[PDB]
Write a protein that holds these residues in place. Sequence first.
Motif, PDB file in Angstrom:
ATOM      1  N   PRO A   1     -14.016  52.330 -15.686  1.00 38.30           N
ATOM      2  CA  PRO A   1     -13.672  51.743 -14.389  1.00 38.30           C
ATOM      3  C   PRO A   1     -12.242  52.073 -14.015  1.00 38.30           C
ATOM      4  O   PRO A   1     -11.385  52.281 -14.876  1.00 38.30           O
ATOM      5  CB  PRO A   1     -13.835  50.240 -14.635  1.00 38.30           C
ATOM      6  N   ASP A   2     -11.994  52.117 -12.707  1.00 42.99           N
ATOM      7  CA  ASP A   2     -10.637  52.321 -12.220  1.00 42.99           C
ATOM      8  C   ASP A   2      -9.731  51.204 -12.719  1.00 42.99           C
ATOM      9  O   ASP A   2     -10.158  50.064 -12.898  1.00 42.99           O
ATOM     10  CB  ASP A   2     -10.610  52.377 -10.691  1.00 42.99           C
TER      11      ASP A   2
ATOM     12  N   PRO B   1     -28.915  55.243 -11.909  1.00 43.04           N
ATOM     13  CA  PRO B   1     -27.915  55.242 -12.989  1.00 43.04           C
ATOM     14  C   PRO B   1     -26.505  54.918 -12.517  1.00 43.04           C
ATOM     15  O   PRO B   1     -25.746  54.292 -13.268  1.00 43.04           O
ATOM     16  CB  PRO B   1     -28.018  56.664 -13.556  1.00 43.04           C
ATOM     17  N   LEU B   2     -26.128  55.301 -11.294  1.00 37.99           N
ATOM     18  CA  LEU B   2     -24.770  55.079 -10.808  1.00 37.99           C
ATOM     19  C   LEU B   2     -24.725  54.188  -9.571  1.00 37.99           C
ATOM     20  O   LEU B   2     -23.755  54.250  -8.812  1.00 37.99           O
ATOM     21  CB  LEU B   2     -24.090  56.419 -10.523  1.00 37.99           C
ATOM     22  N   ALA B   3     -25.744  53.356  -9.351  1.00 39.79           N
ATOM     23  CA  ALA B   3     -25.734  52.479  -8.184  1.00 39.79           C
ATOM     24  C   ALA B   3     -24.614  51.453  -8.303  1.00 39.79           C
ATOM     25  O   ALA B   3     -24.241  51.030  -9.401  1.00 39.79           O
ATOM     26  CB  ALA B   3     -27.080  51.773  -8.020  1.00 39.79           C
ATOM     27  N   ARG B   4     -24.068  51.054  -7.155  1.00 41.93           N
ATOM     28  CA  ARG B   4     -22.878  50.214  -7.193  1.00 41.93           C
ATOM     29  C   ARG B   4     -23.206  48.770  -6.821  1.00 41.93           C
ATOM     30  O   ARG B   4     -24.121  48.520  -6.032  1.00 41.93           O
ATOM     31  CB  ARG B   4     -21.809  50.758  -6.243  1.00 41.93           C
ATOM     32  N   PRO B   5     -22.504  47.786  -7.407  1.00 41.44           N
ATOM     33  CA  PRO B   5     -21.503  47.906  -8.476  1.00 41.44           C
ATOM     34  C   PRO B   5     -22.161  48.243  -9.808  1.00 41.44           C
ATOM     35  O   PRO B   5     -23.128  47.558 -10.144  1.00 41.44           O
ATOM     36  CB  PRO B   5     -20.874  46.507  -8.540  1.00 41.44           C
ATOM     37  N   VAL B   6     -21.655  49.246 -10.541  1.00 39.82           N
ATOM     38  CA  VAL B   6     -22.315  49.667 -11.774  1.00 39.82           C
ATOM     39  C   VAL B   6     -22.335  48.533 -12.793  1.00 39.82           C
ATOM     40  O   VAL B   6     -23.296  48.400 -13.556  1.00 39.82           O
ATOM     41  CB  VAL B   6     -21.666  50.951 -12.350  1.00 39.82           C
ATOM     42  N   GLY B   7     -21.309  47.678 -12.792  1.00 43.46           N
ATOM     43  CA  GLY B   7     -21.307  46.491 -13.628  1.00 43.46           C
ATOM     44  C   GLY B   7     -22.489  45.565 -13.402  1.00 43.46           C
ATOM     45  O   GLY B   7     -22.860  44.819 -14.313  1.00 43.46           O
ATOM     46  N   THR B   8     -23.083  45.585 -12.211  1.00 36.95           N
ATOM     47  CA  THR B   8     -24.306  44.831 -11.964  1.00 36.95           C
ATOM     48  C   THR B   8     -25.551  45.684 -12.197  1.00 36.95           C
ATOM     49  O   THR B   8     -26.475  45.263 -12.898  1.00 36.95           O
ATOM     50  CB  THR B   8     -24.304  44.272 -10.535  1.00 36.95           C
ATOM     51  N   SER B   9     -25.582  46.896 -11.640  1.00 38.85           N
ATOM     52  CA  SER B   9     -26.823  47.663 -11.625  1.00 38.85           C
ATOM     53  C   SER B   9     -27.186  48.171 -13.014  1.00 38.85           C
ATOM     54  O   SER B   9     -28.368  48.206 -13.379  1.00 38.85           O
ATOM     55  CB  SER B   9     -26.709  48.829 -10.641  1.00 38.85           C
TER      56      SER B   9
ATOM     57  N   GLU C   1     -16.576  53.541 -10.304  1.00 41.91           N
ATOM     58  CA  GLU C   1     -16.102  52.323  -9.654  1.00 41.91           C
ATOM     59  C   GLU C   1     -14.634  52.498  -9.297  1.00 41.91           C
ATOM     60  O   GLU C   1     -13.763  52.429 -10.169  1.00 41.91           O
ATOM     61  CB  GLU C   1     -16.313  51.098 -10.540  1.00 41.91           C
ATOM     62  N   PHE C   2     -14.375  52.732  -8.015  1.00 42.94           N
ATOM     63  CA  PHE C   2     -13.031  52.820  -7.457  1.00 42.94           C
ATOM     64  C   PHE C   2     -13.163  52.767  -5.944  1.00 42.94           C
ATOM     65  O   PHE C   2     -14.231  53.040  -5.392  1.00 42.94           O
ATOM     66  CB  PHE C   2     -12.322  54.102  -7.897  1.00 42.94           C
TER      67      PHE C   2
END
Lengths: 446, 445, 443, 445
Positions: free
Chosen positions: A85-86, A168-176, A10-11
């Motif tokens: 996260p960034d 596994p790394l779909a964005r936003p990772v905080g949601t996925s 996430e950046f």
Amino acid sequence: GPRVTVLVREFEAFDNAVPELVDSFLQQDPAQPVVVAADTLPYPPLALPRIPNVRLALLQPALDRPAAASRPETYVATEFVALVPDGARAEAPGLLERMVEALRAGSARLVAAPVATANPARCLALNVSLREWTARYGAAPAAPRCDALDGDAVVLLRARDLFNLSAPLARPVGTSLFLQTALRGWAVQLLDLTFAAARQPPLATAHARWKAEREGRARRAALLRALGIRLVSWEGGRLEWFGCNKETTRCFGTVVGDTPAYLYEERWTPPCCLRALRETARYVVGVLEAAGVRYWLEGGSLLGAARHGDIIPWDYDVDLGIYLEDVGNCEQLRGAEAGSVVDERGFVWEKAVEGDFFRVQYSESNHLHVDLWPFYPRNGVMTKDTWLDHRQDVEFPEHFLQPLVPLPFAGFVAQAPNNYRRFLELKFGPGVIENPQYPNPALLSL
Amino acid sequence: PRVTVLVREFEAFDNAVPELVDSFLQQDPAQPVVVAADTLPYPPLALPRIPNVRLALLQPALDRPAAASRPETYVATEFVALVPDGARAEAPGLLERMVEALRAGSARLVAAPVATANPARCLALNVSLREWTARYGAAPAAPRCDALDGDAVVLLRARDLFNLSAPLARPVGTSLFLQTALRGWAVQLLDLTFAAARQPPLATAHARWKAEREGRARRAALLRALGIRLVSWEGGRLEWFGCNKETTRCFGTVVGDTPAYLYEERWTPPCCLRALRETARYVVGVLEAAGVRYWLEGGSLLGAARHGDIIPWDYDVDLGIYLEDVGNCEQLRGAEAGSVVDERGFVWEKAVEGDFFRVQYSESNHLHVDLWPFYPRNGVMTKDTWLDHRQDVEFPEHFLQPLVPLPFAGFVAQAPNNYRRFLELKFGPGVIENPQYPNPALLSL
Amino acid sequence: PRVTVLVREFEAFDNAVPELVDSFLQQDPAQPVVVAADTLPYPPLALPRIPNVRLALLQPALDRPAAASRPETYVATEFVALVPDGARAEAPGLLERMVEALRAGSARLVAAPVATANPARCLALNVSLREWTARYGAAPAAPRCDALDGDAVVLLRARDLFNLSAPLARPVGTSLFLQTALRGWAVQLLDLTFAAARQPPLATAHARWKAEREGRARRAALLRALGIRLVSWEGGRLEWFGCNKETTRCFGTVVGDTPAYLYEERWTPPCCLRALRETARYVVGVLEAAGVRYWLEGGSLLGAARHGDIIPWDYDVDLGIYLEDVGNCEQLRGAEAGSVVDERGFVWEKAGDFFRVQYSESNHLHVDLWPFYPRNGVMTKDTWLDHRQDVEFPEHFLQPLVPLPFAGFVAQAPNNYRRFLELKFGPGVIENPQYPNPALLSL
Amino acid sequence: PRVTVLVREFEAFDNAVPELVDSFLQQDPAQPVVVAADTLPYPPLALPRIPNVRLALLQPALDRPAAASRPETYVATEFVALVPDGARAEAPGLLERMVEALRAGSARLVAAPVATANPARCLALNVSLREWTARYGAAPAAPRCDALDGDAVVLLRARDLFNLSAPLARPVGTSLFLQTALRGWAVQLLDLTFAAARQPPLATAHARWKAEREGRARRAALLRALGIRLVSWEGGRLEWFGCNKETTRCFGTVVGDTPAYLYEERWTPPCCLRALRETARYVVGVLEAAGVRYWLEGGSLLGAARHGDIIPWDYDVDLGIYLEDVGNCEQLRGAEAGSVVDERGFVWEKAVEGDFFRVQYSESNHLHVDLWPFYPRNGVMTKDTWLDHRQDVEFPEHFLQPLVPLPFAGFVAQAPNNYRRFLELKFGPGVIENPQYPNPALLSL
Ligand SMILES: *OC[C@H]1O[C@H](O)[C@@H](O)[C@@H](O)[C@@H]1O[C@@H]1O[C@H](CO)[C@@H](O)[C@H](O[C@@H]2O[C@H](CO)[C@H](O)[C@H](O*)[C@H]2NC(C)=O)[C@H]1NC(C)=O
Ligand SMILES: *[C@@H]1O[C@H](CO)[C@@H](O)[C@H](O)[C@H]1NC(C)=O
Ligand SMILES: *[C@@H]1O[C@H](CO)[C@@H](O)[C@H](O)[C@H]1NC(C)=O
Ligand SMILES: *[C@@H]1O[C@H](CO)[C@@H](O)[C@H](O)[C@H]1NC(C)=O
Ligand SMILES: *[C@@H]1O[C@H](CO)[C@@H](O)[C@H](O)[C@H]1NC(C)=O
Ligand SMILES: *[C@@H]1O[C@H](CO)[C@@H](O)[C@H](O)[C@H]1NC(C)=O
Ligand SMILES: *[C@@H]1O[C@H](CO)[C@@H](O)[C@H](O)[C@H]1NC(C)=O
Ligand SMILES: *[C@@H]1O[C@H](CO)[C@@H](O)[C@H](O)[C@H]1NC(C)=O
Ligand SMILES: [Ba+2]
Ligand SMILES: [Ba+2]
Ligand SMILES: [Ba+2]
Ligand SMILES: [Ba+2]
Ligand SMILES: [Zn+2]
Ligand SMILES: [Zn+2]
Ligand SMILES: [Zn+2]
Ligand SMILES: [Zn+2]
């Protein structure tokens, strides 16, 4: 030897502190494995240290790379992985393995630590029901044991757990990430550790923040669409929709075999499609009651009203019977015989393919519809000049309509035949209210 | 062998896949078959729900493991046969002889045309990622090919197919051979033929008219994803997939004089260079007709003196003009009042950075020619604004008295006389003979 | 070089199949593995739900097609490795080594023992469907053998395994090698050893003892279904899976003097012969105890003269006795009034004009006693059946009787019994065996 | 010749299969005929030794290849006519009339009754696997049926017949139509009548008695093998085929709050529910008569509120009792000293897992009613041991003052007052209107 691989997903390319993040972790252990993951190579250049323990994973296909290059597990050699996260930084030494010691000692698959930014991680409850295309968030009752996190946190889990997920790394990772892990019944423990924030944190200006939030929301909306989340509720409210509406097509195409596409995907009716169905039924009922047309809940709508007072969760339309001799009392219906009618509120009133009935569509584009079945007495029997194979499309005694009874349905009160229990079991069979079944069980059953 | 039939090319609204699968099952009831699709087809494909016929959905799903979308986990056999919709297995044992053709020959892929309206042709193919270009031609040594076009059954080892980065990207006919040709693998076109479906798909001209456009759409999405901007064929035909006058340029704003594509180890996209060439031609014609004295400058003159064209990684065109000539040109005089969109969509502007002019290809596409106005001093050409470039210097005016013709970007352009010493004065000795990136400290050749 | 791991032997209540499947996926994440069961195992197996790991259910179901229970449909590779529960892959490349062995060697099956407490030992094995018998022994040509005992990973070609009639019938250790040894296939038992599971199943003595209980039930059901009534071993050990004192006999009532088993190209089940041999022994002992004199008659005498035992397709035992002695024995004067069940379970009946002793009230394998009396030196009786060998005969053939081994004991036969047999049956009968009714079915 | 006569339903000891096969061979000597048996029929059938007559032995054998037990191996025609013993072809062409009728119509099976004492009659049939139930009744759309009762020749495509899981399971008159009705297939009873054998089989009372005993035996094993636990005729004249007081219950120890039938994509067996309703009824009858304060609890109260019966996938009955009332019941106060079997075979025992009581249907069948003691502390109803269940909660005692009659599982039982709010507290809002199975978090969903 290190047992954790730091992973940064996430950046934003146009504004980030990923170089500071990476350099902070290398200052505590120069051999620390660190992976930055991106869908394309970030520009401006990240210009990370050109050492072997710092690798950049490009997670999209290339004509000149092997399949392994776009698979994130290829880049992780350790048992555990830390999603950083960034805007986070490593100032205290050894926190990465207080998190593994807590993960090994504990009972949850994920452990997390807030990063001391403006948006520090808050513990959430989360229920995912793919059957209803819904994610329901709320306050976490068993905090610090959560289903999901909101805000900035480092999340640590086994590489074997993370990379066996489908996205596994779909964005936003905080949601996925937490949609995947919550649905698996996995828990995340918010540990009482704090990571320091970047000394010069990213997106400092309002304008930088505005672009980052616009792209983030875009990624979130595409993510939920891709994964079949049509509705996000917080504590039953603050509804956030990601399905159809008045301007779109309906979610599922033309039904064949009386089995819509969502049943073949082991889901029920999308909640946007049910929301539009309830809206249209109330609108139509409101119009008919104002115009003086005698209606009554019919078919699956009466059955849904008699059982739990709403549209049946896997049903795809609303059915009303009307007295034929009342059709003239409605402007929309008397125009529907001459041709299609778009009324003032965007609903389309039409006479049918064949079968002497009236469909009212939610809008010109969204063909979710209320079907109107007109009957006329014939020696105390209600009959139509046409029929369809369906079992419950039959004649019936007119005395079932001599009084009509209120019945709660779909958030309002509608009219139903008297003794609707007996009338339903006439058309459907004994026990229909107490034993729910799919439209075509020979093709697809519950 | 034990080939798995793998079906990838078909449309959910109109296909021939059940009859395809049934035909192979008639030869071998237990034949392993994998139908692949991005989303679950609706209306239902209605294949036999027998354990040897499986449907692999390649989409992410919240309730599926990573393995469910990776197709190699549905294939247990050593060999795998890509079969297109509309084909059909009549003559038994056809796959079995394809496998023995593969083990005997030297090619890694073997291929069998399908007797449809367009059986597979044998083609040559070179792929140049650095230039974003794929060049097809007639096959030099058929039946050995770099690629095919048309319907074919393609058999190769599963280990080889699934070690590709995008094994089942659509259209497979384009995607697979781009990946195999780049690796130097050959496909051998065999003297065998598969039959067509009895009821081929896309029977009506309207459904026959809905496949192509999602096909053409999928093809353009593929080539963009893989960084192919230009496709050319022997015969001169060219297909573009990059810039044009109505889009933006391919690459964003350049940092440290080093454009993004150089970090990706590619050079300037062929569509950007080609806009730059037709913008340089157009501006030169406007300035000549206006009576503005111009000369090639900077990297444009350097590329002219090397090979008469833009430097292959360069991102703009530079010309010097006499400052006292700006009033001779209509577009330049509007420029100092504001941005000017002229007769053919080019955008003339006075730059915010320095005291120079910029001619953009279009309103949306900011590939540009920069006009550097100079004025004489005491025989020394000078301007009042300067960049942090080494080649941004003053120079004696005699280099401009007179100018000499110099082919550049498909046309003849005016260059300083004695341009070798001119270039060496601005760039340093040996510049013509020693190409180098804009900022070697950040990224060198 | 692609092998499917195939798991069939495990107990749903206590197994290590998850560790087994996981260990192979440690060496190859895409390794094809088929777990096969008759019903859905509960508690749940908790296997990874990935496409290369599939659970195959072999029993029929109203909502599944015929293909769903045919296991070859779950296996697409060339080679198949039956792996028993308790095994695990630890070394890499172990199944390719077995595959190299198979192509290099001459045996159609290849096997590597699992380092459990019962590692596979080699065994010889003849199968005799005609005699409903399978005989095991030590293997002379080990490691080339007919069958295995104990735990092993067996690798063969899928086309070989799945053209067998019952490829996954349990126990596979018994069922597989009965079918492969019958076909003449050998199994080669290799140098190599699979490791045992780190947390092996059946830890507790209770769990083991439940596995062995139901394992003994499946083996009995297997042998009964596949026509194996007797398993014998070098050293003399016997395992019976047929009739006994408390069951039906193995075949229904006979028509045309041709039992059902002959039409199946089989001879008398060995448990039925055993019952006849012990009934003949008991009945002889009772008649001798009572002073009744007897002699082998009919097929019993023929079999005794030919090889000292019941003719291998015969279904009863026949004794001639002197009528005037009939009163001497209690059981038979009782049989004249009604059916008599004696103090050892035998059933004496009077029917014809002969007597019948059944092995038990449930098992109607019988000795027939034919009473004969002398009329002018000719042994005759009053009722006759339609057999050539049912005739009068000179009494001097019984004056005296001679000892003749029969069915494990010493019997009494007529003197000069080869001439006697040639009298009733015809010349050359001893050396020319023939089925009871050649018109219907010949030998 | 396109129809193969297949004979499956007959008895070895008494049959007219020879007359049957010879009748068809007089009509056409080439007529393909297969007699199917598990083992070689004895007495020998003595069928004509010609290539078009074949005996199929379906059991697995140590000597034979897999193909020998597969009935499709013995049929090379497009259709199959299942002919029962007792039937007989007297007029030519009856099989060829049934075909022209089979393809003219929309049903996948056609049938003609045999003129025996038990000619085929048209039946309705619905198959609910989730309820393990087969509901029969008179056929509303006669002569279009789901099933047949009695003797008929049934013709269908061999590809249809031999793709079912158990195509020739006995009795065929039951197994076939269970499979075909479940697939939504219809059978059309034609006006054609096959004659009866001149010497009909089982013509004596003793022959019929043995045949019926074996018939009922095979049917009973067939239904359990296929998970049909209950057969109904117009909702009545029930036949049970599951557990009872003398056996174990159908599923056995429930791990993870998820019984075995859930993983088999079915709900609670009907015999297991019938035992639960009986035990609940008997227990509350004892509690009301002993003076024990009880109320429906957990999923029983929820089922009673939703539909007034046990939730169809639930596996026990729960009741809240008043702790201080336990002394009033003799069965209960014996249970603490040890397990107690009462006059009617119900088993009352203190809990292994917690501090509660459990009444089992019988010593062998552990379908049980759980009883949960709560005592009044400071106005709230609370016990001392707890489960990691969500609905195991303390609750205000006003919910029990007073109690309410609510229909449940066939009788009227006591529920808390305002049980909707009661349920909503411990289960959540909308619980009555939104059902779900016990622990859906496994990811095996
Ligand atoms: O292994 C089965 C039985 O074999 C022998 O009888 C002994 O080993 C028994 O111990 C064993 O029966 C088990 O006995 C225990 C205690 O004596 C019972 O609790 C157990 O029944 C299950 O118990 C659990 C609680 O731990 C639940 O109550 C569950 O509902 C219950 N299951 C059934 C079907 O009764 C019992 N095991 C079985 C399978 O009955
Ligand atoms: C989550 O789901 C559980 C189970 O249905 C429910 O009890 C709880 O209230 C839900 N929480 C939220 C925030 O939806
Ligand atoms: C999934 O987990 C298993 C452990 O059971 C591991 O072997 C495998 O590598 C994991 N998959 C990925 C992609 O990491
Ligand atoms: C491909 O490249 C080779 C070698 O560079 C060249 O000879 C050939 O002409 C090229 N083919 C095409 C179609 O451009
Ligand atoms: C198998 O058969 C041979 C006869 O050809 C015999 O010598 C050998 O002993 C038999 N094996 C066993 C174990 O009896
Ligand atoms: C039986 O053997 C044949 C010949 O090799 C083969 O084609 C067939 O697939 C086998 N049957 C199986 C594997 O079930
Ligand atoms: C079978 O189910 C249908 C469903 O519509 C119903 O109408 C019919 O009455 C049912 N018949 C029986 C016998 O249950
Ligand atoms: C089942 O149907 C398929 C249809 O493709 C057919 O090929 C197959 O032969 C059928 N099975 C049997 C056993 O006839
Ligand atoms: Ba409806
Ligand atoms: Ba330049
Ligand atoms: Ba005899
Ligand atoms: Ba309960
Ligand atoms: Zn919708
Ligand atoms: Zn471009
Ligand atoms: Zn026996
Ligand atoms: Zn039951």
